[PDB]
Amino acid sequence: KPDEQGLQQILQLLKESQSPDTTIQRTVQQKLEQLNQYPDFNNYLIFVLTKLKSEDEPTRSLSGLILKNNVKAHFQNFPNGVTDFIKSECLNNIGDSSPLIRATVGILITTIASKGELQNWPDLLPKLCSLLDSEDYNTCEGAFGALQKICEDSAEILDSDVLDRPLNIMIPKFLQFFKHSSPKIRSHAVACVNQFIISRTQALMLHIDSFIENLFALAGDEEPEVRKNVCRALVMLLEVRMDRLLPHMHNIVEYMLQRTQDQDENVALEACEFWLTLAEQPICKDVLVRHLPKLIPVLVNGMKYSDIDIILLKISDWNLRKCSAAALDVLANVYRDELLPHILPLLKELLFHHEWVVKESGILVLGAIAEGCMQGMIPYLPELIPHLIQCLSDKKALVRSITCWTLSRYAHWVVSQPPDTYLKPLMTELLKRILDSNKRVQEAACSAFATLEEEACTELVPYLAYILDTLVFAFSKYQHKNLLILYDAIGTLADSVGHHLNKPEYIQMLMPPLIQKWNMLKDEDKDLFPLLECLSSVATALQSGFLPYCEPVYQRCVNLVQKTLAQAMLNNAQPDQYEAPDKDFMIVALDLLSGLAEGLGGNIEQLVARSNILTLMYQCMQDKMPEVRQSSFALLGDLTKACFQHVKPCIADFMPILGTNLNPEFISVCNNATWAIGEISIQMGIEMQPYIPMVLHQLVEIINRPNTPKTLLENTAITIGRLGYVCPQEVAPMLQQFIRPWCTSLRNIRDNEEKDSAFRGICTMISVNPSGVIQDFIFFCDAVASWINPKDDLRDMFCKILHGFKNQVGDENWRRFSDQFPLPLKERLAAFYGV
């Protein structure tokens, strides 16, 4: 019987509510395991049926609450028969006259519905919807509260007559409740209708005016819950139905403005979100101009740290400050310089204020409006920047950290000025802050310095030893969260300084501790991604100087490529049992490898030979992700250039893949494949013959393709040139089909090794098949005339062709032909090639 062990459960429940903290872990262990078969049959008798017998609401509500957790962890193992009894007891007590009991029944219903999905309780929503009218308050509230959580949490809507009535009936029913006595109920009502906004539910769309009208009539409710929901509704509608808000816009704005400075922190944040959303709409600029005088002070005031905020640091991912600052950043990009009349008089007050909370809010404002109001800020920079550099030493950390940030926002202007005026002190001061005693100032400074480095470049060279001393020391001082930012600082330093880093002293202090970590990190580490990206930057700047250190870098990268591929395979077979990897670990490993193959170019040959790198590369070229293909094709060309002797035995395998990937849909992949083919043909010589048919036609098609980026066109032109240089016989016949775009393309390129080999290829092709050029000889001349400093032998090839043509067409026709050229064109061909 249940009477025996039932008084044992109720005793275990009374003991569960002790006060020992020792007798609590014991009764929790005793109850969590007491999951036989039918304890939940009991867990409701206590909670729903034994009123007076074992009364004491705390006990009953705890019964239902422990059982709620049983539903959370072990619902799948639930007997079908007990659940049905559970469910019917809940719905029969949804509106219990005891607030605590009906709140317990409430969370019970909510969770069951969340765990066992939509259809598994088919009776629920129809019963909830119906109960909304049930003429006793508690039942109405109970139903509505439950109904609110179900639309909100799980259930992605799309649920007409899954409610057992059309949304056409349901939505106006909701709207009626906007007029209920109880504040809790009209909140529930706005929350429900808010779920149907974004999805553009037709029923709501055909009830907008009624909705909008009812929203306006609630704007003024005491209950902040209602005010908040009204704001959410209005923010949401801003994107879904602008057309219907528009005629009320100024009237709405004035409400939102009052809401953005609301008593309640929540309503305020919700109201504030309005300015963000509106700011990103084309209609914004015209609507708000008039409100800027009132808006800006409100946003700027909202950007101060609150009293609570400060304490917790000395917070939320999103708050009033982050929101206002975001809005102000966006509003600055919209109005640009026209925002300044509204900002500067307020800025003047804030920046030199005696209270730091005020000062630091002003510094934030200054940073926030940077990108947008740059041009108009330039006049005031010569006094503000020196003053910010001063704040960098402020006694208060939170001023120190934000100043770093704001300074970095003006980094570009700083560098554009004489190096000694602003850049020097900024650097001197930022380098000191990188080693601040306060973690937040460390991050801010280190981050700001990274922004500065990228902008300064060469100009950092004089301070390189002091910059490197600070960064390397930071390794020892810093802890996790900060290392990530430090890696990026080092990395950018390599990018900005370039070859200037390649000196034994620099290498001997930087590389040992970077590598120390490279061999410490467990492959599934957050630290590993930025450490890869950093080293890839370093190996490119430390060209040949990176040599002593590549062994473990190269090998681990290859390992990383392999592993990621396997993991991605496992995940494709078994999407549930086996987990997806982050392919960005692969792309970054490939880039490092190709960075390595370029800096070391040749010294790498032994490492390439003893690895699965080419096999791995092949697989990477099969990948579904364009970026992965792209990266390996890049690596292909780099290895072709570095140590072709190991690529050659695979060229028969690679060529068809390169052909398969000569597809303009994926520009970057196409680019790299095209580039790789070209580099291969130079290394292969005549032997490239059998591989031309599969590649050529696609290139001539790609080069003739209307909308094609400049770079891909240029690379196609180069590659066709190089193939032709090596196999004139196979390529020459097609000279007439690609010569127009080829010339239009390569005519705009610097006089380099690429342009040389390409034009060398077209000269060998013209000489094999001259008739291909005549019809469009105007284009060849334009392309030859673009050369400023050609190699002597190339100038002669140009010379022979140009003359050959002139001799064919004769002096008279040529004279006519030359009239077409612009002056500087006529003149170069005449001076350089004697024509």
Curated annotation (Swiss-Prot):
Entry-linked InterPro entries: ARM-like, ARM-type_fold, HEAT, Importin-beta_N, Importin_beta
Gene Ontology MF, one: RNA binding
GO biological process: protein import into nucleus
Compartments in which it is found: Cytoplasm; Nucleus
Bilayer-crossing regions: none
Keyword tags: Acetylation, Cytoplasm, Host-virus interaction, Nucleus, Protein transport, Repeat, Transport
Site positions for Important for interaction with cargo nuclear localization signals: W405, W675
Annotated HEAT repeat ranges: 6-33, 38-76, 85-118, 124-161, 168-198, 211-238, 250-277, 342-370, 382-409, 423-456, 464-497, 505-543, 551-602, 613-644, 652-685, 693-728, 736-769, 778-809, 812-832
Keyword Protein transport in annotation: yes
A GO CC term assigned to this protein in UniProt: nucleus
Ranges where the Importin N-terminal domain occurs: 28-96
Assembly, per entry: Identified in a complex that contains TNPO1, RAN and RANBP1. Binds HNRPA1, HNRPA2, HNRNPDL, RPS7, RPL5 and RAN. Interacts with H2A, H2B, H3 and H4 histones. Interacts with isoform 1 and isoform 5 of ADAR/ADAR1 (via DRBM 3 domain). Interacts with SNAI1 (via zinc fingers); the interaction mediates SNAI1 nuclear import. Interacts with SNAI2 (via zinc fingers). Interacts with RPL23A (via BIB domain) and SRP19; this interaction is involved in RPL23A and SRP19 import into the nucleus.
Function: Functions in nuclear protein import as nuclear transport receptor. Serves as receptor for nuclear localization signals (NLS) in cargo substrates. May mediate docking of the importin/substrate complex to the nuclear pore complex (NPC) through binding to nucleoporin and the complex is subsequently translocated through the pore by an energy requiring, Ran-dependent mechanism. At the nucleoplasmic side of the NPC, Ran binds to the importin, the importin/substrate complex dissociates and importin is re-exported from the nucleus to the cytoplasm where GTP hydrolysis releases Ran.
PANTHER family xrefs: IMPORTIN BETA
Family to which the UniProt record says this protein belongs: Belongs to the importin beta family. Importin beta-2 subfamily.
Protein name per UniProt: Transportin-1
